[PDB]
Design an enzyme around this catalytic site. Sequence first.
Site, PDB file in Angstrom:
ATOM      1  CG  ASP A 263     -13.526 -38.996 -21.271  1.00 25.35           C
ATOM      2  OD1 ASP A 263     -14.604 -39.199 -21.734  1.00 25.35           O
ATOM      3  OD2 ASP A 263     -12.993 -39.834 -20.639  1.00 25.35           O
TER       4      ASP A 263
ATOM      5  CB  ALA B 141     -11.766 -44.847 -44.717  1.00 29.26           C
TER       6      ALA B 141
ATOM      7  CE1 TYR C  11     -13.662 -40.913 -34.987  1.00 23.23           C
ATOM      8  CE2 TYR C  11     -14.962 -40.805 -32.975  1.00 23.23           C
ATOM      9  CZ  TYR C  11     -14.527 -41.500 -34.089  1.00 23.23           C
ATOM     10  OH  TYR C  11     -14.946 -42.790 -34.315  1.00 23.23           O
TER      11      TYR C  11
ATOM     12  NE  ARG D 272      -9.748 -40.353 -22.088  1.00 21.63           N
ATOM     13  CZ  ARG D 272     -10.347 -41.236 -22.873  1.00 21.63           C
ATOM     14  NH1 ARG D 272      -9.669 -41.882 -23.781  1.00 21.63           N
ATOM     15  NH2 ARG D 272     -11.615 -41.466 -22.744  1.00 21.63           N
TER      16      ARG D 272
HETATM   17  N1  LIG Z   1     -13.903 -48.392 -32.693  1.00 25.01           N
HETATM   18  C1  LIG Z   1     -14.918 -47.730 -32.188  1.00 25.01           C
HETATM   19  O1  LIG Z   1     -15.180 -47.779 -30.988  1.00 25.01           O
HETATM   20  C2  LIG Z   1     -15.795 -46.888 -33.061  1.00 25.01           C
HETATM   21  C3  LIG Z   1     -16.873 -46.208 -32.520  1.00 25.01           C
HETATM   22  C4  LIG Z   1     -17.651 -45.448 -33.353  1.00 25.01           C
HETATM   23  C5  LIG Z   1     -17.314 -45.381 -34.709  1.00 25.01           C
HETATM   24  N2  LIG Z   1     -16.281 -46.025 -35.201  1.00 25.01           N
HETATM   25  C6  LIG Z   1     -16.011 -45.887 -36.623  1.00 25.01           C
HETATM   26  O2  LIG Z   1     -15.993 -47.092 -37.318  1.00 25.01           O
HETATM   27  C7  LIG Z   1     -15.030 -47.072 -38.339  1.00 25.01           C
HETATM   28  C8  LIG Z   1     -13.986 -48.170 -38.155  1.00 25.01           C
HETATM   29  O3  LIG Z   1     -13.413 -48.139 -36.874  1.00 25.01           O
HETATM   30  P1  LIG Z   1     -12.167 -48.979 -36.455  1.00 25.01           P
HETATM   31  O4  LIG Z   1     -12.228 -49.242 -34.987  1.00 25.01           O
HETATM   32  O5  LIG Z   1     -12.043 -50.156 -37.364  1.00 25.01           O
HETATM   33  O6  LIG Z   1     -10.961 -48.018 -36.730  1.00 25.01           O
HETATM   34  P2  LIG Z   1      -9.669 -48.333 -37.526  1.00 25.01           P
HETATM   35  O7  LIG Z   1      -8.719 -47.191 -37.377  1.00 25.01           O
HETATM   36  O8  LIG Z   1      -9.198 -49.702 -37.159  1.00 25.01           O
HETATM   37  O9  LIG Z   1     -10.227 -48.351 -38.964  1.00 25.01           O
HETATM   38  C9  LIG Z   1     -10.193 -47.280 -39.893  1.00 25.01           C
HETATM   39  C10 LIG Z   1      -9.302 -47.503 -41.140  1.00 25.01           C
HETATM   40  O10 LIG Z   1      -9.285 -46.387 -42.012  1.00 25.01           O
HETATM   41  C11 LIG Z   1      -8.021 -46.176 -42.549  1.00 25.01           C
HETATM   42  N3  LIG Z   1      -7.858 -44.788 -43.013  1.00 25.01           N
HETATM   43  C12 LIG Z   1      -7.662 -43.679 -42.227  1.00 25.01           C
HETATM   44  N4  LIG Z   1      -7.549 -42.570 -42.915  1.00 25.01           N
HETATM   45  C13 LIG Z   1      -7.679 -42.970 -44.237  1.00 25.01           C
HETATM   46  C14 LIG Z   1      -7.649 -42.254 -45.449  1.00 25.01           C
HETATM   47  N5  LIG Z   1      -7.474 -40.937 -45.526  1.00 25.01           N
HETATM   48  N6  LIG Z   1      -7.810 -42.958 -46.594  1.00 25.01           N
HETATM   49  C15 LIG Z   1      -7.987 -44.282 -46.510  1.00 25.01           C
HETATM   50  N7  LIG Z   1      -8.031 -45.059 -45.431  1.00 25.01           N
HETATM   51  C16 LIG Z   1      -7.869 -44.336 -44.311  1.00 25.01           C
HETATM   52  C17 LIG Z   1      -7.073 -46.627 -41.448  1.00 25.01           C
HETATM   53  O11 LIG Z   1      -5.768 -46.836 -41.921  1.00 25.01           O
HETATM   54  C18 LIG Z   1      -7.827 -47.807 -40.827  1.00 25.01           C
HETATM   55  O12 LIG Z   1      -7.489 -49.083 -41.299  1.00 25.01           O
HETATM   56  C19 LIG Z   1     -14.409 -45.689 -38.313  1.00 25.01           C
HETATM   57  O13 LIG Z   1     -15.167 -44.942 -39.174  1.00 25.01           O
HETATM   58  C20 LIG Z   1     -14.674 -45.217 -36.895  1.00 25.01           C
HETATM   59  O14 LIG Z   1     -14.678 -43.837 -36.738  1.00 25.01           O
HETATM   60  C21 LIG Z   1     -15.529 -46.758 -34.422  1.00 25.01           C
HETATM   61  O1  LIG Z   2      -5.719 -45.276 -21.031  1.00 30.81           O
HETATM   62  C1  LIG Z   2      -6.946 -45.215 -20.805  1.00 30.81           C
HETATM   63  C2  LIG Z   2      -7.818 -44.961 -21.857  1.00 30.81           C
HETATM   64  C3  LIG Z   2      -9.181 -44.891 -21.609  1.00 30.81           C
HETATM   65  N1  LIG Z   2      -9.625 -45.075 -20.365  1.00 30.81           N
HETATM   66  C4  LIG Z   2     -11.048 -44.993 -20.099  1.00 30.81           C
HETATM   67  O2  LIG Z   2     -11.711 -45.949 -20.911  1.00 30.81           O
HETATM   68  C5  LIG Z   2     -12.957 -45.467 -21.345  1.00 30.81           C
HETATM   69  C6  LIG Z   2     -13.041 -45.481 -22.866  1.00 30.81           C
HETATM   70  O3  LIG Z   2     -11.895 -44.947 -23.458  1.00 30.81           O
HETATM   71  P1  LIG Z   2     -11.588 -45.010 -24.992  1.00 30.81           P
HETATM   72  O4  LIG Z   2     -10.517 -43.983 -25.274  1.00 30.81           O
HETATM   73  O5  LIG Z   2     -11.322 -46.455 -25.338  1.00 30.81           O
HETATM   74  O6  LIG Z   2     -12.877 -44.570 -25.788  1.00 30.81           O
HETATM   75  P2  LIG Z   2     -13.735 -43.249 -25.736  1.00 30.81           P
HETATM   76  O7  LIG Z   2     -13.172 -42.493 -24.556  1.00 30.81           O
HETATM   77  O8  LIG Z   2     -13.480 -42.595 -27.073  1.00 30.81           O
HETATM   78  O9  LIG Z   2     -15.149 -43.743 -25.542  1.00 30.81           O
HETATM   79  C7  LIG Z   2     -13.026 -44.012 -20.905  1.00 30.81           C
HETATM   80  O10 LIG Z   2     -13.836 -43.886 -19.735  1.00 30.81           O
HETATM   81  C8  LIG Z   2     -11.588 -43.668 -20.589  1.00 30.81           C
HETATM   82  O11 LIG Z   2     -11.468 -42.653 -19.595  1.00 30.81           O
HETATM   83  C9  LIG Z   2      -8.717 -45.321 -19.342  1.00 30.81           C
HETATM   84  O12 LIG Z   2      -9.125 -45.482 -18.207  1.00 30.81           O
HETATM   85  N2  LIG Z   2      -7.422 -45.393 -19.563  1.00 30.81           N
END
Ligand SMILES: NC(=O)c1ccc[n+]([C@@H]2O[C@H](COP(=O)([O-])OP(=O)(O)OC[C@H]3O[C@@H](n4cnc5c(N)ncnc54)[C@H](O)[C@@H]3O)[C@@H](O)[C@H]2O)c1
Ligand SMILES: O=c1ccn([C@@H]2O[C@H](COP(=O)(O)OP(=O)(O)O)[C@@H](O)[C@H]2O)c(=O)[nH]1
Lengths: 336, 336
Positions: A288, A90, A159, A285
């Site tokens: 970024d 979460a 974040y 962005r």
């Molecule tokens: N997706 C990625 O690229 C990535 C990269 C690095 C880390 N992470 C981490 O991995 C984990 C899961 O990622 P994900 O892609 O499944 O994201 P996701 O948003 O799909 O999953 C997170 C979940 O947490 C829930 N949530 C948010 N706030 C909450 C709260 N206050 N109480 C209870 N539930 C709550 C959301 O509703 C959601 O279902 C997260 O911790 C995220 O930060 C993801």
């Molecule tokens: O609408 C978008 C969103 C993301 N990106 C590019 O996709 C890569 C990853 O973006 P994302 O937001 O998925 O993850 P994060 O930037 O958090 O790694 C980055 O280089 C962004 O600049 C893009 O070209 N168009």
Amino acid sequence: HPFTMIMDEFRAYDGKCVLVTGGAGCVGSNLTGNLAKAGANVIILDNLSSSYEWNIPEYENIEFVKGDILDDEVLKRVFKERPDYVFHLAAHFANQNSVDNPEKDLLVNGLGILKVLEYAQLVGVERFVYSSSGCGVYGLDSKIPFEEHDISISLHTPYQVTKLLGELYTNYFHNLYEMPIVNARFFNVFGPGEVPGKYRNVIPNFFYWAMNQQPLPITGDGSETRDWTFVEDIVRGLMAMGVRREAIGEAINLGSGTEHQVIEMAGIINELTENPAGVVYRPRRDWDAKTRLLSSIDKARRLLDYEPQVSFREGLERTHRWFTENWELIRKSAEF
Amino acid sequence: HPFTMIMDEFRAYDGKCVLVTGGAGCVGSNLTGNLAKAGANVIILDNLSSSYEWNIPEYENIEFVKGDILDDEVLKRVFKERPDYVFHLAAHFANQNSVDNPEKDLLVNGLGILKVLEYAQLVGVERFVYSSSGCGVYGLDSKIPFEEHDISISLHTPYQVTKLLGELYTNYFHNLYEMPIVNARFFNVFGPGEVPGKYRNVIPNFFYWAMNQQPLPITGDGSETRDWTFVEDIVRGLMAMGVRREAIGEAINLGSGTEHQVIEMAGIINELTENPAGVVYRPRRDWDAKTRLLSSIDKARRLLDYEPQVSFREGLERTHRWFTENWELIRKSAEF
Ligand SMILES: NC(=O)c1ccc[n+]([C@@H]2O[C@H](COP(=O)([O-])OP(=O)(O)OC[C@H]3O[C@@H](n4cnc5c(N)ncnc54)[C@H](O)[C@@H]3O)[C@@H](O)[C@H]2O)c1
Ligand SMILES: O=c1ccn([C@@H]2O[C@H](COP(=O)(O)OP(=O)(O)O)[C@@H](O)[C@H]2O)c(=O)[nH]1
Ligand SMILES: NC(=O)c1ccc[n+]([C@@H]2O[C@H](COP(=O)([O-])OP(=O)(O)OC[C@H]3O[C@@H](n4cnc5c(N)ncnc54)[C@H](O)[C@@H]3O)[C@@H](O)[C@H]2O)c1
Ligand SMILES: O=c1ccn([C@@H]2O[C@H](COP(=O)(O)OP(=O)(O)O)[C@@H](O)[C@H]2O)c(=O)[nH]1
């Protein structure tokens, strides 16, 4: 078959109680399905703030609890079940969302993990596995490819700050109270189970736009790179982290160990969706600043026998299939 | 006189508006007095949760605002004055207090600095100087003596965690919004202006106990060491940090660069107070895993011309004098 440690190491979950916070999201839905297949009893705690109930897999041994990790009443409700394992997924997600809403980001990512850790201390757990982030702990002063010792304290979004904060707290509980924690550092996860939307990742948003025959907006020049990691590879890593004693107290990258350009990723998605609209270029962005990300996955190889099984291309095909099979639910659910 | 940069660098504060959060405490009371002497208009924001109004120096150009850094109403009240400088010293203090009360520690140290930073962004500041901690950022994996690049993410109390969190947020505001921040890493500050009490530092507690002819309780074997830094040296560092352009975006140790054993410190205090009760030995406090602390102050030398002026012995004599001159106020104020 070569899959002896993947199969019989994981049978260790059979009959165990596993709490997965954030379990209705991308990583969570995939993880909970695999835990249920392995015979675990699974409790999901999720407030559905960035996820949809339809995403949760249908298994008899998954119990869905709609609630917030900041709510002490619901925390007692799930922790009185005495989970053997906690996977804390979460999180308030992610970079832009956090820049816009830094205080809520801190409350969810900071105070939320702290509360979950406090209850885990009260009941005792065999393992507490936290989904940290590569982006969150590696800075412009970190050398590519990123190795786990080479973290930064100079970050670019709230974040990133609060992802590192999670590790600060898990390490604290490990150091003072001997909690068996593991810090998983995910790199740009993708696959089935992420619904598109304003604050979501590029791959599902690009699929959604490409399948509406819209041009894919590239935020940069297209040469920016990411280490994209398929969700089922992430899940295999997490499940290993729960059971390997050598993972205890460790921070470990879960990545593919390869990088791809944004322009290639966009080209593949347009090809698969037969999108005739191509791409358009937009400014980067503002937060970024880290336009290249690449992990070193050698620690995961050593401690977990982790090895990505799914290529970038294969991963994107599987993602595409999920989009086509759930297109109406996705159309209805996507919030931009 | 050799004091040209100490004197004329600081005249830069003359007529400026300076907000000091936590201004009624030990470092704050000393800092605000020196700022007022330099001709600054000073606003103190302090909730008096671990400080006493009598500690604030009496200058016409110090305005005391009793309030909380978590309260957006009082934050608007002070920030609408448009401070040129912010020294953010308010903090939930310290190691034991934080272990007992980890959620309040996070709210005050995390959400509190975030809010103060958010308002500083709105009005614009020439400098935002944050009192981080040596103990908070250097771990068992950090090499002694501690250099600023060699931080740890493996900490032992929630206070340590949230001291580092402060740097994470100041660096974020610097990186994304170009806020001119400085992260001061203090090492075991001591001197006039710290009232004794349950959750307070060893030196004032030892003075209080020694002046009641009680034995000084040593939590350990007495060979444990600290780098104790006299508060007026800390203040000179902070005032340099406000004005030197080379301090912008930097983390800088403020220490004495020497270490002393707990047993020596206790001996000096018993000698000065003519305490006949000596010492008694008690177990180490459970979170106290870092039993040696010693800073490297070479970065501060380079960027600030920082050099401690007051010896450990001289510092303890000055502390003693403050105790004797304010003994009745201290007796009344001390909460154990
Ligand atoms: N997706 C990625 O690229 C990535 C990269 C690095 C880390 N992470 C981490 O991995 C984990 C899961 O990622 P994900 O892609 O499944 O994201 P996701 O948003 O799909 O999953 C997170 C979940 O947490 C829930 N949530 C948010 N706030 C909450 C709260 N206050 N109480 C209870 N539930 C709550 C959301 O509703 C959601 O279902 C997260 O911790 C995220 O930060 C993801
Ligand atoms: O609408 C978008 C969103 C993301 N990106 C590019 O996709 C890569 C990853 O973006 P994302 O937001 O998925 O993850 P994060 O930037 O958090 O790694 C980055 O280089 C962004 O600049 C893009 O070209 N168009
Ligand atoms: N004393 C040390 O050895 C040491 C070492 C490293 C860092 N520091 C840091 O330096 C700063 C000052 O230290 P100190 O020794 O003067 O401590 P202190 O307790 O004397 O000063 C902190 C002040 O903040 C106030 N405060 C606490 N919570 C507040 C809140 N929510 N809103 C408003 N005000 C609040 C207190 O009432 C107090 O006057 C703190 O940030 C501390 O963590 C101190
Ligand atoms: O009642 C006490 C309090 C502290 N100390 C010792 O004094 C040193 C510094 O303690 P303090 O709590 O002042 O600061 P910190 O431990 O946070 O550096 C440590 O070695 C403590 O073990 C002690 O002997 N008796």
